[PDB]
Design a binder for this molecule. Structure first.
Ligand SMILES: NC(=O)C1=CN([C@@H]2O[C@H](COP(=O)(O)OP(=O)(O)OC[C@H]3O[C@@H](n4cnc5c(N)ncnc54)[C@H](O)[C@@H]3O)[C@@H](O)[C@H]2O)C=CC1
Ligand SMILES: NC(=O)C1=CN([C@@H]2O[C@H](COP(=O)(O)OP(=O)(O)OC[C@H]3O[C@@H](n4cnc5c(N)ncnc54)[C@H](O)[C@@H]3O)[C@@H](O)[C@H]2O)C=CC1
Ligand SMILES: COc1cc([C@H](O)[C@@H](CO)Oc2ccccc2OC)ccc1O
Ligand SMILES: [Mg+2]
Lengths: 273, 273
């Protein structure tokens, strides 16, 4: 679908990959709603586009994607202020990783709430309107290659949710197709971003009784490598996927062989038909 | 691991695949705790083993695997009444399928609660004791080939949860291995069972506001095909998986080519590293 003249609603749109996607959709003629739990991120993002005199084409909403009431309100606000959206980017996510034995129910609930229920809430809150307006659209869900290649127990909560997001995206494709809505699941490798600030981004209700505060502290000090990919490069991949209705977008090929070995082991478990 | 003398805790153990696993584990010397939400299933299972003069080695607990308090209770009751468990079979599941546009938040919450949080609750409630007792053990999670092969939107909630269970099992392997606990994900194709009674098995709190009551009513009328696999055949596959610590068990080969096509599409999305 053509991006010119559309409105895109982007969760986690005020940092990292979501912001990279925002820049590139804007550059291709979309107007933007950036939805984010971090007010300081939102302010920074707003100032960025204002410095380039694009502030008119950008709206910001502070919310938690795991709050269904806020998501319903945001769908109404998007339509009322910016129109649509035609393009739904369910991109917000956090890193709930840590020693597996230390993880508590609060950590599981947190990890699944943001990284799996966030995209589901986006679909449930926004796609009824996307269907009803009858001008098609597109959905991008940001999963991870960690949802595909074998991962260690330290990243169990993350990997589990991201694998579910890949399958979610695959399965909804034919339903969304009924109303000319395409879908893409984005599976990145290492991208420069601020996901190391995940501890700050954890919603209040998931903090008490967490077992992973110490890991979140260490994560906060992690240096962003200069050889990680730029968010705007990922943005261009998403422009391409939206224009050409591509189901899968992977940013890196470094886990091709590890994925192949996993896939082989799965096939090998199958008897002869 | 050696099955003789162990205790196996089996969710959904009073019907279908779980009951097939129950029979073959008992045949190989395990004692059983069958945990199930359906009292009539539990009573039938009880009579079956009583008629075969094995009742002393089978204890039944009525519970909902998505109730964490009940699962904590079950871990205490299992240990106190039958010992252990050494073998944890997170097998309970339901069919939340239906026209995708009809599904509501209640249907998502139901489907994920039972099919994804059920196994997680099992791991969280039972594996600390399994580590502590220091005699090793094994975990079997029942996913589905629907978590692997591409599925239509009618089965979105089911597929999404089952894909997650596969990845969950992969990721916990190294942690569990620290304490000589092996893990297996079971991925069945069509097995003779009573999963068509899923409407009856939906916990009360997920009933009001569901959009799929009509689908559940149709499902209840579905005839179990004679050429579907016997649960006891699946049971023997699981005996082998526990004895030999096999990560993957698939019961059918019918989706080899559709999985291959999916895997190839995933790999094709990856650039040259
Ligand atoms: N190496 C990487 O950066 C990779 C990132 N991903 C995924 O990319 C997505 C975007 O993350 P990044 O750009 O890397 O990090 P980021 O932290 O720079 O951007 C994420 C934004 O989402 C926001 N956010 C977090 N929780 C939220 C919530 N509950 N509600 C609303 N907004 C929330 C954050 O405040 C942040 O502004 C995530 O889903 C992440 O899992 C996947 C693969 C690789
Ligand atoms: N063709 C098949 O039968 C296939 C089954 N599966 C999976 O096999 C597993 C076992 O299901 P089946 O043996 O087929 O059906 P089943 O309905 O005969 O057995 C499942 C048992 O789990 C119980 N149960 C349901 N919800 C529960 C809950 N919240 N708490 C405690 N117990 C609960 C049921 O009462 C039932 O006795 C499920 O996870 C299912 O998704 C996967 C692929 C294929
Ligand atoms: C760069 O920050 C992170 C990035 C991820 C990503 O989802 C993925 C990158 O695709 O992490 C991995 C994926 C595949 C293999 C190894 C990965 O890192 C451990 C997870 C957690 C993070 O803190
Ligand atoms: Mg009780």
């Amino acid at each position: 679908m053509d991006i010119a003249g559309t409105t895109a609603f982007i969760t986690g749109g005020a940092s990292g990959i979501g912001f990279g996607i925002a820049q590139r959709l804007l550059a291709n003629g979309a107007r933007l709603v950036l939805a984010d739990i971090r007010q300081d991120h939102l302010d920074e993002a707003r100032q960025f586009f204002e410095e380039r005199q694009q502030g008119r084409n950008v709206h910001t909403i502070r919310l938690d994607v795991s709050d269904r009431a806020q998501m319903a309100e945001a769908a109404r606000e998007c339509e009322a202020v910016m129109g649509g959206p035609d393009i739904l980017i369910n991109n917000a996510g956090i890193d709930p990783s840590g020693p597996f034995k230390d993880a508590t129910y609060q950590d599981w609930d947190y990890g699944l709430a943001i990284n799996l229920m966030g995209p589901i809430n986006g679909i449930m809150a926004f796609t009824p309107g996307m269907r009803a307006r009858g001008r098609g659209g597109h959905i991008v869900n940001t999963a991870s290659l960690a949802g595909l290649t074998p991962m260690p127990s330290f990243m169990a909560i993350y990997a589990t949710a991201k694998a579910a997001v890949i399958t979610l995206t695959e399965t909804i494709r034919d339903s969304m197709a009924e109303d000319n809505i395409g879908v893409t699941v984005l599976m990145p490798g290492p991208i420069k971003s601020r996901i190391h600030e995940s501890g700050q981004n954890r919603p209040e209700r998931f903090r008490a009784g967490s077992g992973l505060a110490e890991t979140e502290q260490q994560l906060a000090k992690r240096v962003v490598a200069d050889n990680w990919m730029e968010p705007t490069e990922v943005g261009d991949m998403i422009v391409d996927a939206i224009v050409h209705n591509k189901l899968y977008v992977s940013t890196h090929g470094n886990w091709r062989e590890t994925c192949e070995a996993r896939f082989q082991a799965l096939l090998d478990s199958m008897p002869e038909a």
